[PDB]
């Protein structure tokens, strides 16, 4: 799987372990991420910040 890295400047492939791309963004905006990467399990979603997971190309 080839997802995007933290900054939308380059892309990287999630190696074994992280078969799901994650994206961490603040409620500050509905479309304003702070940082992203690759992970295996999705963390708990809070009111302050929320996280989304997806097993697709350039999902995060």
From Swiss-Prot:
PROSITE patterns: SNAKE_TOXIN (PS00272)
A Gene Ontology biological process term: killing of cells of another organism
Keywords (A to Z) from UniProt: Cardiotoxin, Cytolysis, Disulfide bond, Membrane, Secreted, Target cell membrane, Target membrane, Toxin
Subcellular location: Secreted; Target cell membrane
Superkingdom of the organism of origin: Eukaryota
One GO MF term: toxin activity
InterPro entries, alphabetized: Cytotoxin_Cobra (IPR003572), Snake_3FTx (IPR003571), Snake_toxin-like_sf (IPR045860), Snake_toxin_con_site (IPR018354), Toxin_cobra-type (IPR054131)
Summary of the tissues where the protein is detected: Expressed by the venom gland.
GO cellular component, one term: other organism cell membrane
Disulfide bridge map: 3-21, 14-38, 42-53, 54-59
Record family assignment: Belongs to the three-finger toxin family. Short-chain subfamily. Type IA cytotoxin sub-subfamily.
Subunit structure: Monomer in solution; Homodimer and oligomer in the presence of negatively charged lipids forming a pore with a size ranging between 20 and 30 Angstroms.
Stated role: This three-finger cytotoxin is a basic protein that interacts and penetrates into the cell membrane, with the tips of all the three loops. Cytotoxins which have a Pro-30 (P-type) interacts with membrane stronger that those which have a 'Ser-28' (S-type). CTII interacts with membrane stronger than CTI.
Listed name of the protein: Cytotoxin 2
């Amino acid at each position: 799987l080839k997802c995007k890295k933290l900054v939308p400047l380059f892309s990287k492939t999630c190696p074994a372990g992280k078969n799901l791309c994650y994206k961490m963004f603040m409620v500050a905006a509905p479309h304003v991420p702070v940082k992203r990467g690759c992970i295996d399990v999705c963390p708990k979603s809070s009111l302050l910040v929320k996280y989304v997971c997806c097993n697709t190309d350039k999902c995060n």
